Design a protein around this nucleic acid. Structure first.
Ligand SMILES: [Mg+2]
Ligand SMILES: [Mg+2]
Ligand SMILES: [Mg+2]
Ligand SMILES: [Mg+2]
Ligand SMILES: [Mg+2]
Ligand SMILES: [Mg+2]
Ligand SMILES: [Mg+2]
Ligand SMILES: [Mg+2]
Ligand SMILES: [Mg+2]
Ligand SMILES: [Mg+2]
Ligand SMILES: [Mg+2]
Ligand SMILES: [Mg+2]
Ligand SMILES: [Mg+2]
Ligand SMILES: [Mg+2]
Ligand SMILES: [Mg+2]
Ligand SMILES: [Mg+2]
Ligand SMILES: [Mg+2]
Ligand SMILES: [Mg+2]
Ligand SMILES: [Mg+2]
Lengths: 82, 123, 155
RNA sequence: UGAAAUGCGCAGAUACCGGGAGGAACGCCGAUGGCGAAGGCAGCCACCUGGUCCACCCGUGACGCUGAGGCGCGAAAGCGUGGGGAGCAAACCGGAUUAGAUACCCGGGUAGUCCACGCCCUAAACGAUGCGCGCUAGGUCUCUGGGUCUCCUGGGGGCCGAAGCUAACGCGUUAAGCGCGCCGCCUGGGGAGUACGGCCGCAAGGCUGAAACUCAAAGGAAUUGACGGGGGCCCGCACAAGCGGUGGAGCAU
């Protein structure tokens, strides 16, 4: 946008590093890793970001939730600046 | 003591903005409040309380009256969705109050409580 | 004037001073298009200023205007709901406009029974931060040292 | 709030901090997605349970498709008994707008929305398109299993399109194409989904459902145009900026 549309995303391809490397998706403890799959707030990021497929996120999510109940990961965190 | 001129030097600056009025607040580093002003506190009675001035102006009185207890630097805390955001802030950034941090904490129900008819659609 | 933005016509410099603003002012005093009459009036009024004042006539004029020129206005708009004031900076093309216009008005507003007198003096009154002329620049730039609520425009 | 007012606040409200009770829904993921016969169904967890797709070709051996009547399921609302009742909100109470407002706006508020069992059964219950099966170009995106795996083969969801179809819009291997089986249903509008009879319901009502009479139409899609308190673009002293004037008086016409 404005004359950019800012929606030009050439199917990524070779996605940098695919966001990390080799980390389960049903780890109801492995925070260290999960902490990255969340916006400034415990707001699970969309597909647009991260770098996951169908069944995957269905899991990542199903997990992050299982994590919050363990008090490991956050539901909603405050915003700095702006 | 009498009315006691208490020194605080630092505290909070909660700001509530919405389609109706803008309430700024000053508090101690432990939540406890010191002094709050608003749009109402200064003339402005009707929709003039949601007037962006309702931000700064109040967000000056919060300051002035808040510098009287020392406070030189404050940690801002925005809330609500409407107008007056940042203004109340900038207002403090010229008020004489150094601004430590600016944070947002607007409370959005993870879907609970049926909103009033007045609220329902969006797109 | 939809597009093209009309182009500011430029007058011919003065004959006794050769400096735009002079004519421009001259012009504002004029009525029914009479130059000469209106001309004498300014030149007359320019004379009366070398006496009642030692300062050259031009400097009294030019320095009486800049004290008039407004630097802010209030172009109303419809933020919806009501008719807001909305104040803005004065394009330097306009300041002059109002400025001189103002003078000539306030002038005629005064008591004296003349043309020059009315003019010379209020000029002079203007070169000291005084006069019904300057009075208006004040009542103006005041309705604009604050504005009035455009928060829906967030930015 | 368009402005407001009712309303709540010095028995100190709002705004901020801490703690406690309660009900309801359940953010972001989440989608152009998924599953289900439909209604419908999303915090997480476990358990009990349905359906379904694929790979293997292993077992039965036509055992199949449809389905009048029957029976069961069936949003919301409503009904009965009992509980619960945070927010919301018919009726109703006030506030305001209006020429008048038993309305749009505003502040409260009961049934209700909630759960249990029982009842109701309707719906733009719509894909407005019965079920099953065989046949007829592709391309593109997407969910899910197999795969010698960014390519081919199966199931499901969208898009665009061959032939063909269609009154047109459109549909087009998720056919509204080509065919076969079976089932429901239509046979001009209004009167009527009304009247009567019957069945059903605690009731509200529901299903079945006419005619007299009356009108030459009711109607579907698309074309041109006009119109919109629809939209984008765009001109004209049309507005604005500005100068003079008219509306006042005497007179003239
Ligand atoms: Mg206060
Ligand atoms: Mg208005
Ligand atoms: Mg199972
Ligand atoms: Mg059957
Ligand atoms: Mg119900
Ligand atoms: Mg009940
Ligand atoms: Mg109550
Ligand atoms: Mg039909
Ligand atoms: Mg294989
Ligand atoms: Mg398919
Ligand atoms: Mg097509
Ligand atoms: Mg064709
Ligand atoms: Mg009926
Ligand atoms: Mg009967
Ligand atoms: Mg019809
Ligand atoms: Mg039609
Ligand atoms: Mg012209
Ligand atoms: Mg005009
Ligand atoms: Mg007249």
């Amino acid at each position: 946008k404005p004359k950019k549309e800012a929606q030009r995303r050439p199917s990524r391809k070779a996605k940098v590093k695919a966001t990390l490397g080799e980390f389960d998706l049903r780890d109801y403890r492995n925070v260290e890793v999960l902490k990255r799959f969340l916006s400034e707030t415990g707001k699970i990021l969309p597909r647009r970001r991260t770098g996951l497929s169908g069944k995957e996120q269905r899991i990542l999510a199903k997990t992050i939730k299982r994590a919050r109940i363990l008090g490991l990961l956050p539901f909603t965190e405050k915003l700095v600046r702006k | 003591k009498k009315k006691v001129k208490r020194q605080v030097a630092s505290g909070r600056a909660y700001i509530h903005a919405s389609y109706n009025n803008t309430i700024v607040t000053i508090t101690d580093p432990d939540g406890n409040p010191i002094t709050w002003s608003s749009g109402g506190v200064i003339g402005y009675k009707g929709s003039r309380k949601g007037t962006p001035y309702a931000a700064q102006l109040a967000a000056l009185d919060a300051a002035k009256k808040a510098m009287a207890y020392g406070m030189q630097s404050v940690d801002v805390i925005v809330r609500g969705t409407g107008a007056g955001r940042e203004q109340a802030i900038r207002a403090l950034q010229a008020s004489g109050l150094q601004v430590k941090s600016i944070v947002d904490d607007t409370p959005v129900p993870h879907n609970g409580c049926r909103p009033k008819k007045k609220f329902r659609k969006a797109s | 004037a939809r597009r093209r933005r009309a182009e500011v016509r430029q007058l011919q410099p003065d004959l006794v001073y050769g400096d735009v603003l002079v004519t421009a002012f001259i012009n504002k005093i004029m009525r029914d298009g009479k130059k000469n009459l209106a001309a004498r009036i300014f030149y007359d009024a320019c004379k009366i200023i070398q006496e009642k004042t030692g300062q050259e006539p031009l400097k009294v004029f030019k320095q009486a205007v800049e004290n008039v020129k407004p630097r802010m206005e209030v172009r109303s708009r419809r933020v919806g709901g009501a008719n807001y004031q909305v104040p803005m900076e004065v394009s330097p093309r306009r300041q002059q406009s109002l400025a001189l216009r103002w003078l000539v008005q306030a002038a005629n507003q005064r008591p004296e029974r003349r043309a020059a007198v009315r003019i010379a003096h209020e000029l002079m009154d203007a070169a000291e931060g005084k006069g019904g002329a300057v009075k208006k620049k004040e009542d103006v730039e005041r309705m604009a040292e604050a504005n009035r609520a455009y928060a829906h425009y967030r930015w």
